[PDB]
Nucleic acid binder design. Structure first.
Ligand SMILES: [Mn+2]
Ligand SMILES: [Mn+2]
Ligand SMILES: [Mn+2]
Ligand SMILES: [Mn+2]
Ligand code: NA
Ligand code: NA
Ligand code: NA
Length: 320
DNA sequence: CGGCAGTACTG
DNA sequence: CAGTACT
DNA sequence: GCCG
């Protein structure tokens, strides 16, 4: 990154807008930061700044202040609430609205939350694992977690296919959590497995807490056995084989990669989701779907790229 | 002016 | 529904 | 915040 001296201060504002709930302004900052991190050389003129997609007048002005003066004065006017709002919204299950409510009610520390806040079931689990959920794991540990889920699943049906997606499949050396996708080539055998699979993992002691238990998605907490182990976030999704390619693409990400791909599809009158790539999608002036369109056959990730007119990218090239 | 991805889950 | 979460 |  050629422009650390710029992006480092912009990311402070981005985080401030994000925890205060100004999601679209924060999105603009996030994109401009990526755009700056993707530029070969350091940026040296306001005209070069606008050069970059994702950099407008206001962002170019901010970059110039940074280069001429070495600082951005807006940083000196960030609300004193922001560190606390960040502290609170790092509780799993608490976002900007809950953080702002707790702040308005006078809470300033996790001790205040522990002792005085009403917590949802999810948030109480988030708080108990506050430190652990901010820690990443070595990818070798993600491998052990993936293999634990697969062994429990294959015990029920040898035909079940389990793959760790997210940062793991993109090849990262550390992982924030483990994202396991499960399907069955027979197109049927994936149905109703969650009850038995989660019970199998829970009877081990491996599954320690449940956050979300849906018919297709599980989000929870696990811990491998023995000393020196931390609690880790584990997500599981079970999908029909018909949707494997789009589910794999979704679950491998990155998030910004997915959003970019889905935006591209929309420009082409198509729609991309974890379920399917669809064509002839009908939308209104506001960009919302009014007519469903037709699911396109996508047996492989390659097929999704091809139908969108894009060259295939390995998971490691999706780490946007 | 107004979209900025599309979906699942909780209560 | 609003809120939060997933990539 | 940016951009069509
Ligand atoms: Mn992940
Ligand atoms: Mn995850
Ligand atoms: Mn722990
Ligand atoms: Mn993530
Ligand atoms: Na630009
Ligand atoms: Na949170
Ligand atoms: Na009090």
């Amino acid at each position: 990154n050629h422009n650390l001296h710029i992006t480092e201060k912009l990311e402070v504002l981005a985080k401030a807008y994000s925890v205060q709930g100004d999601k679209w302004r924060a999105l603009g900052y996030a994109k401009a930061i990526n755009a700056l991190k993707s530029f070969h050389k350091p940026v040296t003129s306001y005209q070069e700044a606008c050069s970059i997609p994702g950099i407008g007048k206001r962002m170019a002005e901010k970059i110039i202040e940074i280069l001429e003066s070495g600082h951005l004065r807006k940083l000196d006017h960030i609300s004193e609430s922001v560190p606390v709002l960040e502290l609170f919204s790092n509780i799993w299950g608490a976002g900007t609205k809950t953080a702002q409510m707790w702040y308005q009610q006078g809470f300033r520390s996790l001790e205040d939350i522990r002792s005085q806040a009403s917590l949802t079931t999810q948030q109480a689990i988030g708080l108990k694992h506050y430190s652990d959920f901010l820690e990443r794991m070595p990818r070798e540990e993600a491998t052990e977690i993936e293999q634990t889920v697969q062994k429990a699943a294959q015990a029920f049906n040898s035909g079940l296919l389990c793959v760790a997606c997210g940062s793991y499949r993109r090849g990262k050396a550390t992982c924030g959590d483990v994202d396991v996708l499960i399907t069955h080539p027979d197109g049927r055998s994936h149905r109703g497995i969650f009850s038995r699979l989660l019970d199998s993992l829970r009877q081990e002691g491996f599954l320690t807490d449940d956050l979300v238990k849906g018919e297709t998605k599980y989000l929870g907490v696990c811990r491998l056995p023995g000393p020196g182990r931390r609690h880790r976030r584990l997500d599981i999704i079970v999908v029909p084989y018909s949707e494997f390619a789009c589910a794999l693409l979704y679950f491998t990400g990155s998030a910004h990669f997915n959003r970019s791909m889905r935006a591209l599809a929309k420009t082409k009158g198509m729609s991309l989701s974890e379920h399917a790539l669809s064509t002839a999608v009908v939308r209104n002036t506001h960009g919302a779907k009014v007519g469903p369109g037709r699911v396109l056959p996508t047996p492989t990730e390659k097929d999704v790229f091809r139908l969108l007119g894009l060259p295939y990218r390995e998971p490691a090239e999706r780490d946007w």
